[PDB]
């Protein structure tokens, strides 16, 4: 009859003892048990068998599921009235469209080209509470690329749905990015700059165009506004007068290294604005996703401050971190594979977490990155977007992150 | 042994959880202790048996947990020896007991039963199965590392150990 010592669960199915002879290997084995017990809360994975399925995951997540809490704990949006579609294999269309999809309140759905997935009918009739009962009115869908990247006969289909529909589009990657750029706007007096190669660029810095900043530079996720970011050619020596036009007199960060954006270029868009041009750069994918996530990401910075604040609002300005994080594959084998973190980016905002480019290692400068910018007191939170990222990398992120 | 029952208050520690595989034994011990005519610690001859059924809920109960059955006071005197030792042999999953001992000392014990298995693992990569079926609550896995992680901590029969209750089973398959 052992009388064991510590009170028990109503529901407790075995009373486990666990020993050994090394106070060693015992403090291992709780210490896994605890990670392992917490890694159901911790850990997240939003992946589908192709990019498509895998948007849908992010959507089904996020938007009308459990409804909004005011920790921004919760859903993005619950009474979605929106969304934003693009095309599987046109990703240089869609490339900025993240800021858009927040600005939107809309998750950000992929479709193939020439006629729409049922999978992704189906989801846009949840995520909008579509019913056959009530007029479809009010609702919109906006179509981020051209006839080439979306059909038209996706778009006769999502009229036949009742909805209103939008396209943004150019003749090329530039102007399709100037056009969605139009309609988020410069609330903010700001706009990112990235190159036509400089694709997982734009997926490092979609997370912080993505958050909806205040009049002052607060976050404010209820009456902000996110800022836009517009694709340049890169390699050349003016800008056009749309772009011109565009950015006006307003700030201006360039994401990416000297191969991506001349210094010509950069001088061009300093002309233009009459301000000075911020360079966020880094040699690699992963480097210069390290320095956005160092620069935008620190404690100093607004989005630490508000960050901790939904995880104890009676916290200090002292207690700032970074709680959230996403991860996805940087495309190094393959370009394309960066679509799965433009369906995150919007989320991201709301949830005022990074997203980590890694498929096979993770850089030492994204390993100090983390650790720099990591919260210390409160717990965290790892979502993995997409199939395909080694557990080296997860492992990593995880320790990192003290999970 | 009621040398058992008296070692409870020898301590700080004043809360116990017993397997209701062990209700025959626990309840004679129980006897026992109050029955003591000559040690030097003797249990009260007060001892009560609450019992509770955890998945439903009242909040003025003092475990926040609806009472079912009936209360028992448990004595030699009062003849609840069987009802006692055979309702908590056949508890089902959810419904468990409270029962608080008082002693001449003036001290006071919480035992509880619970309808749980006792099973030991000696240790790693163990800890992996023991986490897919089975949910804990992260203070008492820190609490057990906190006497894993104390000066004090000492061996038990040559071995060091850590008792750890389950919230419940966790879902397979997903």
């Known amino acids: 009859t052992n009388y064991n010592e510590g009170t028990a669960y109503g529901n407790t199915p075995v009373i486990l003892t666990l020993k050994s002879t090394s106070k060693s290997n015992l403090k291992t084995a709780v210490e896994e048990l605890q990670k392992l017990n917490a890694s159901y809360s911790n850990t997240t994975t ?27 704990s919760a859903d993005v949006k619950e009474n979605v009235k929106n969304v934003v579609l693009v095309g599987a294999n046109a990703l240089v269309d869609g490339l900025v469209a993240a800021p858009l999809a927040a600005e939107k309140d809309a998750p950000l759905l992929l479709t193939s080209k020439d006629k729409l997935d049922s999978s992704v009918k189906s989801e846009i009739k949840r995520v909008l509470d579509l019913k056959t009962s009530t007029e479809v009115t009010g609702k919109t869908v906006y179509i981020a690329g051209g006839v080439n990247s979306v059909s038209k006969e996706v778009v006769t289909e999502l009229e036949s749905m009742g909805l209103k529909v939008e396209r943004f589009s150019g003749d090329d990657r530039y102007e399709t990015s100037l056009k969605i750029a139009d309609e988020i706007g410069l609330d903010n007096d700001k706009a990112y700059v990235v190159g036509g190669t400089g694709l997982a660029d734009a997926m490092s810095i979609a997370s912080v165009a993505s958050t909806k900043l205040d009049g002052n530079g607060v976050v404010d996720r209820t009456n902000g506004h996110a800022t836009p970011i517009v694709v340049v050619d890169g390699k050349a020596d003016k800008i056009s007068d749309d772009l011109d036009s565009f950015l006006g007199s307003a700030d201006v960060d ?3 290294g000297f191969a991506s954006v001349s210094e010509k270029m950069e001088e061009a868009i300093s002309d233009a604005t009459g ?19 160092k620069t935008y990401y620190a404690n100093d910075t607004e989005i630490a401050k508000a960050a901790v604040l939904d995880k104890d609002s009676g916290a200090s300005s002292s207690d700032a971190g970074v709680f959230n994080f996403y991860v996805a594959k940087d495309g190094s084998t393959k370009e394309d594979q960066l679509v799965d973190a433009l369906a995150v980016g919007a989320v991201a905002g709301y949830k005022l977490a990074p997203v980590v480019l890694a498929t096979d290692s993770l850089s030492s400068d994204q390993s100090v990155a983390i650790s720099k910018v990591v919260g210390e007191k409160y717990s965290k939170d790892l979502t993995q977007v997409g199939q395909g990222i080694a557990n080296s990398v997860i492992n990593k992120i995880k320790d990192l992150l003290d999970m | 042994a009621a040398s058992d029952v008296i070692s409870l208050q020898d301590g700080t520690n004043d809360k116990y959880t017993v397997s209701n595989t062990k209700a025959s ?47 028992q006071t448990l004595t030699t005197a009062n003849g609840n020896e069987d009802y006692v030792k055979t309702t908590l042999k056949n508890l089902d999953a959810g419904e468990y007991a409270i029962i608080d001992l008082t002693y001449n000392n003036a001290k006071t014990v919480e035992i509880k039963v619970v ?52 919230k419940g089973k966790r879902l397979q398959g997903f």
């Open chain 1, 254 to 256: 360039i994401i990416g």
């Open chain 1, 275 to 293: 301000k000075g041009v911020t360079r966020v750069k880094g040699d690699d994918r992963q480097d210069t996703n390290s320095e956005v996530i």
């Open chain 1, 46 to 72: 939003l992946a589908g068998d192709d990019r498509i399925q895998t948007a849908i995951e992010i959507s089904k997540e996020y938007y009308n599921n459990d409804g909004e809490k005011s920790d921004h």
């Open chain 2, 25 to 71: 034994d626990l309840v004679k011990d129980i006897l026992a202790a109050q029955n003591l005519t000559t040690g030097a610690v003797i249990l009260n001859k007060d001892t009560k048996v609450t019992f509770y059924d955890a998945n439903e809920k009242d909040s003025s109960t003092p475990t926040g947990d609806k009472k079912v059955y009936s209360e």
């Open chain 2, 115 to 166: 309808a749980a298995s006792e099973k030991t693992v000696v240790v790693k990569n163990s800890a992996k199965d023991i986490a897919e079926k089975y949910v804990f609550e992260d203070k008492d896995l820190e609490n057990a590392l906190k006497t894993i992680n104390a000066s004090d901590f000492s061996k038990t029969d040559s071995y060091y150990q850590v008792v750890l209750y389950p």
